[PDB]
Structure 1
């Protein structure tokens, strides 16, 4: 009835992200690239604004919603927070995988958000 706990939401997110990335043949997006970010705490928020730059990819539309659950502040294609540094862009396939390592990482510390 009430929302799912933080630890449960994370596992459901990791299991879903892995599932769509294991049977994926070619890149989910047309080789779209995203800005690299620093994986620390506000990863969900920093990661969200980076995905907001990817359009035309429904396979990740649901992902943006689940990420928002950990980041209540919405981001428009005009408002940016972590894209202040001039980092290089990377393929989404790598962005999802790099994020996967950090997602299960916080599970070990049980420190969600």
Structure 2
């Protein structure tokens, strides 16, 4: 199918969001993204900076395939709104939510 990519990414975010016993990614902070078009890349450009957190390894891998181009830490093409950082666990809840929205709206990339 076409929605499979989105289907499984969402499952993942749902996992590390119910399955976070202790604060996700040691309470690390990440740049918040404008949740709109060209945000798959904004999302990866943001989290890519959390090195040392495995709980988010998958998530980041999954993101890389949604993003046309490769993303390196400290690189910010898609991420224009870079004036606020939020804790990672909020970032994924916010991200997660926005995804569900795109799914409902039948938007898969």
RMSD of aligned residue pairs (Cα, Å): 1.5
Larger-gyration structure (1/2)? 1
In the superposition, the TM-score normalised over structure 1's length comes to 0.87
Q: Structure 1 residues 31, 71: CA separation in 2 closer, same or farther (over 3 Å shift)?
A: same
In the superposition, the TM-score normalised over structure 2's length comes to 0.90
Deviation at 1:84, TM superposition (A): 4.2
Task: Describe the SS at the equivalent of 2:25.
Answer: coil
Segment drifting more, 99-108 vs 81-90 = 81-90
Q: Which runs of 5+ in 2 are unaligned?
A: none
Match of 1:9 in 2: 5
Deviation at 1:48, TM superposition (A): 0.3
Q: Which runs of 5+ in 1 are unaligned?
A: none
Q: Structure 1 residues 21, 109: CA separation in 2 closer, same or farther (over 3 Å shift)?
A: same
After superposition, where does 1:87-102 map in structure 2 within 5 Å? 87-102=83-98
Stretches of 4+ moved more than 4 A in 1?
none
The one-character-per-residue Cα deviations of 1:22-44 (angstroms, maximum 9, x if unpaired) are: 02121121211000110002121
Equivalent residue in structure 2 for 1:28, among 20, 24, 28? 24
